[PDB]
Amino acid sequence: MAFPAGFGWAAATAAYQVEGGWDADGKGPCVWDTFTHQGGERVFKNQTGDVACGSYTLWEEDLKCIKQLGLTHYRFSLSWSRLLPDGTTGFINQKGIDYYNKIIDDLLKNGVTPIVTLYHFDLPQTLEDQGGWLSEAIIESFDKYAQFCFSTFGDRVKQWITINQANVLSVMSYDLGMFPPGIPHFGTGGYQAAHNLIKAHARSWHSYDSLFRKKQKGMVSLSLFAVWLEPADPNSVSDQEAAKRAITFHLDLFAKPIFIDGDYPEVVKSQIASMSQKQGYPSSRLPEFTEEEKKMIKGTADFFAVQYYTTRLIKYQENKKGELGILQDAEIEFFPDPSWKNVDWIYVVPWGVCKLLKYIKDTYNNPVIYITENGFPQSDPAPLDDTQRWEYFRQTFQELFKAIQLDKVNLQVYCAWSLLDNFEWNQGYSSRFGLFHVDFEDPARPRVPYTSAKEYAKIIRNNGLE
Numbered sequence: 205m206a207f208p209a210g211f212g213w214a215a216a217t218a219a220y221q222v223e224g225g226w227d228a229d230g231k232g233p234c235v236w237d238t239f240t241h242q243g244g245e246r247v248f249k250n251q252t253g254d255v256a257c258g259s260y261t262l263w264e265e266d267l268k269c270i271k272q273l274g275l276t277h278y279r280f281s282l283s284w285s286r287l288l289p290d291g292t293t294g295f296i297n298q299k300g301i302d303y304y305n306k307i308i309d310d311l312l313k314n315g316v317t318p319i320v321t322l323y324h325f326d327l328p329q330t331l332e333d334q335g336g337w338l339s340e341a342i343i344e345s346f347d348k349y350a351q352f353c354f355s356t357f358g359d360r361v362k363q364w365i366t367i368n369q370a371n372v373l374s375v376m377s378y379d380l381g382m383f384p385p386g387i388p389h390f391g392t393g394g395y396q397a398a399h400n401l402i403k404a405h406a407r408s409w410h411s412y413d414s415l416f417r418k419k420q421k422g423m424v425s426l427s428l429f430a431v432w433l434e435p436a437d438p439n440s441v442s443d444q445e446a447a448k449r450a451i452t453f454h455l456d457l458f459a460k461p462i463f464i465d466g467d468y469p470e471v472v473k474s475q476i477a478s479m480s481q482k483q484g485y486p487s488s489r490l491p492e493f494t495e496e497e498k499k500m501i502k503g504t505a506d507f508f509a510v511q512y513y514t515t516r517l518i519k520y521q522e523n524k525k526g527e528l529g530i531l532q533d534a535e536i537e538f539f540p541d542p543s544w545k546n547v548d549w550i551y552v553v554p555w556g557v558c559k560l561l562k563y564i565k566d567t568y569n570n571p572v573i574y575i576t577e578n579g580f581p582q583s584d585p586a587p588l589d590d591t592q593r594w595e596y597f598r599q600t601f602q603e604l605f606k607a608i609q610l611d612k613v614n615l616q617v618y619c620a621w622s623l624l625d626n627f628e629w630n631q632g633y634s635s636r637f638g639l640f641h642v643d644f645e646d647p648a649r650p651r652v653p654y655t656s657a658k659e660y661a662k663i664i665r666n667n668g669l670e
């Protein structure tokens with residue numbers, strides 16, 4: 205199984221998950237600083253990202269890890285609150301700029317291509333206090349931050365992700381309220397946030413296109429989470445339609461407007477409008493894009509950035525009583541096949557990624573695809589000789605080769621989540637996704653390879669597997 209010459213082999217981190225230095229060098233608070241400091245068991249053992257992997261202090265150690273893997277690409281994110289403590293360019297933290305410039309320069313001198321994310325679940329607290337993604341004001345704040353990032357780093361950075369996993373963010377932060385600001389708004393908050401996230405992405409893309417592209421010649425996208433979905437009963441038409449409709453709801457809701465025509469999928473619009481009307485709302489809970497907005501949003505992605513971990517089965521579930529929520533709007537229930545293995549919510553279903561990549565090829569006119577996340581967690585404490593986990597990786601890579609060679613999918617980058625064991629949001633340090641083990645009890649935060657790191661380096665070196 206030889207991959208295309210020039211295939212990108214990457215690993216990923218995110219600012220709040222690895223950096224620490226949460227209040228170092230003038231850095232402003234982000235929503236996770238506030239959230240984790242409030243405790244109340246919203247996070248495993250009230251843990252925080254105050255220190256995390258200490259990557260703000262120990263970049264050199266991450267670089268060693270990157271070099272040892274032989275990565276061709278490295279995905280990391282910029283901390284908005286580190287660069288602009290209040291969210292705005294009224295005050296620019298030069299130490300923040302110097303830090304990210306050092307990363308970029310170090311990567312490039314070692315032949316590693318940076319894949320840089322502007323924003324990864326970590327809004328400056330000030331901007332959340334002004335309504336976060338539920339308010340229209342954030343669109344301009346994000347655009348200006350994007351312009352600042354392009355101007356500062358765009359002479360060396362050519363692959364950009366504007367917003368990490370916008371679909372999950374809208375649900376977790378604003379619908380379920382599992383993430384900060386932590387207020388549930390079942391069936392309203394997610395859609396209101398999604399509408400603004402899509403517009404802010406589009407605004408930032410046009411800023412890049414109109415102001416930076418001619419000079420810088422890079423490309424810009426946003427990353428999206430995708431769970432592959434199959435009908436629970438394969439002979440049930442209602443289950444067959446429900447599985448397709450649930451893909452449309454979680455993935456195409458964002459991808460269609462941005463990649464196709466600047467509007468939501470029709471089934472999303474009709475389901476939500478119809479439910480909202482019977483529920484007694486004067487408007488659909490899904491905010492409409494104006495005609496000017498559709499025109500702005502259409503064609504605002506230079507490649508398809510997707511994130512895959514798992515698959516689920518889907519059964520139709522009629523919302524007879526008009527219950528409020530996204531699952532109820534979609535009229536679906538999800539669950540795994542009892543025969544599947546799992547580690548946490550990650551049920552190991554490798555053929556899920558092949559099916560997904562085929563779906564993207566067929567639905568989004570054969571785009572360039574970067575898989576910016578894929579991986580497997582281990583429970584803490586985790587064995588260094590992680591042979592079982594590595595087996596799940598190998599199986600996944602066989603499916604990637606299959607998608608490329610059989611389905612002719614234009615997959616160009618595979619990126620493992622994560623380079624490092626890190627702060628796994630509400631799970632804290634109890635869920636270990638890293639190719640490198642990190643000791644969170646030792647003040648030096650030493651990195652040590654898992655077997656997966658060694659085996660993944662072999663894959664990269666051979667540009668494939670047997």
Ligand SMILES: O=[N+]([O-])c1ccc(O[C@@H]2O[C@H](CO)[C@@H](O)[C@H](O)[C@H]2O)cc1
Nearest residue numbers: 478479482483522523524525526527535
């Ligand atoms: O909140 N409510 O009062 C309320 C809401 C919905 C309702 O009917 C349901 O409407 C859905 C969308 O139109 C149909 O897909 C479904 O088949 C039907 O059972 C009845 C009452």
Ligand SMILES: CCCCCCCC/C=C/CCCCCCCC(=O)O
Nearest residue numbers: 375431450453454530531534538549
């Ligand atoms: C803990 C389980 C998480 C594992 C990921 C699987 C998620 C399954 C969701 C199916 C997509 C259905 C489309 C509607 C989105 C609803 C999102 C939500 O509010 O929960």
Ligand SMILES: CCCCCCCCCCCCCCCC(=O)O
Nearest residue numbers: 371372374375394395398453454549
């Ligand atoms: C509001 C519009 C968004 C449409 C719904 C998108 C749903 C995205 C899928 C949610 C999966 C959550 C992943 C986290 C899994 C976990 O670790 O618990």
Ligand SMILES: CCCCCCCCCCCCCCCC(=O)O
Nearest residue numbers: 482483484485486525526527528529
């Ligand atoms: C949550 C109660 C608010 C007090 C009621 C005044 C606001 C009425 C207008 C909103 C109508 C939609 C209510 C949701 C109905 C439902 O989910 O079934």
Ligand SMILES: *[C@H]1O[C@H](CO)[C@@H](O)[C@H](O)[C@H]1O
Nearest residue numbers: 218368369577621628637
């Ligand atoms: C992608 O998924 C990983 C694992 O859940 C998470 O830690 C990242 O922050 C997210 O972008």
Ligand SMILES: [Mg+2]
Nearest residue numbers: 392395396489
């Ligand atoms: Mg709403």
Ligand SMILES: [Mg+2]
Nearest residue numbers: 365368427576
């Ligand atoms: Mg990404």
